[PDB]
Design a protein around this ligand. Structure first.
Ligand SMILES: [Ca+2]
Lengths: 50, 223
């Protein structure tokens, strides 16, 4: 993504790596997962918490 | 279901609850032995709960049956949620009545503007968090493919339809996945994804069931 590289659940916006607000409507026992960056993966719950 | 109302007693017989310790997704009974749900609800172990109104109180009408066959669509894409549909066969046929009944499959695809009925036990808040004991209901129209794509640039496929309000306020939410979007007595949509819930210009995206009628009928015939 431009001068940078997006990881995990991150979404590329021209030249910056923000992430998603996109989520499936599953009910996550402990919410959705965060990755290295802290952003939430679209459709993956946290088996254990965060 | 954000901005809805508590469904009446025997108004949504075809609604089911997928449980894997607790409620995590919804579904539809289309036949005494098959349930339809979203593929992203897939788990190797699933117990189907039928005839539910209050998921926290045992009212006597419930039926707990376990999934025998769990078949997700062959071309399901976990990153785009394309082809987000799933078939579940009950290890035992469900007893049909008032509390438990089936829903019909799309004879034809629903046209924009059609008033549909969405239902589920998902969060009833677009910002806070509040899961209801009683099955919620909501009436929302099918949106044109154009506006659906204007809201979700480069993310809406041919197997997706937006049903809801571009004005926000009412929409399906986390916990409503796999649930029914009934229009005219036919299962037209399956709760899938979207940006948060009830956001202005961000209606919920549902799987376009009418594009899967053939796949469904074939799979049931083979299994
Ligand atoms: Ca109950």
């Amino acid at each position: 993504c431009g001068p940078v590289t997006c990881s995990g659940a991150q979404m590329c916006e021209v030249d910056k790596c923000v992430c998603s607000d996109l989520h499936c409507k599953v009910k996550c026992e402990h919410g959705f997962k965060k990755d290295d960056n802290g952003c939430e993966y679209a459709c993956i719950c946290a088996d254990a918490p965060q | 279901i954000v901005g809805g109302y508590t469904c009446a007693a025997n108004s949504i017989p075809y609604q089911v609850s997928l449980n894997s310790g607790s409620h995590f997704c919804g579904g539809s009974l289309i036949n005494s032995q098959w349930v339809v749900s979203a593929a992203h609800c897939y788990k190797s172990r699933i117990q189907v709960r039928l005839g539910e109104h209050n998921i926290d109180v045992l009212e006597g009408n419930e039926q707990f049956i376990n999934a025998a066959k769990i078949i997700t669509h062959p071309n399901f894409n976990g990153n785009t949620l394309d082809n987000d549909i799933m078939l579940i066969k009950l290890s035992s046929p469900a007893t049909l009545x008032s509390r438990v009944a089936t829903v019909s499959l799309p004879r034809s695809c629903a046209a924009a503007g059609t008033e549909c009925l969405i239902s589920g036990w998902g969060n009833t808040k677009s910002s806070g968090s509040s899961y209801p004991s009683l099955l919620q209901c909501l009436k929302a129209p099918v949106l044109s493919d154009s506006s659906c794509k204007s809201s979700y640039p480069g993310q809406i496929t041919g197997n997706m339809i937006c049903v809801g309000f571009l004005e926000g306020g009412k929409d399906s939410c986390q916990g409503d996945s796999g649930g029914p979007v009934v229009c005219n007595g036919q299962l037209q949509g399956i709760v899938s994804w979207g940006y948060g819930c009830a956001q202005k210009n961000k209606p919920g995206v549902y799987t376009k069931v009418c594009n899967y009628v053939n796949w469904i009928q074939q799979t049931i015939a083979a299994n």
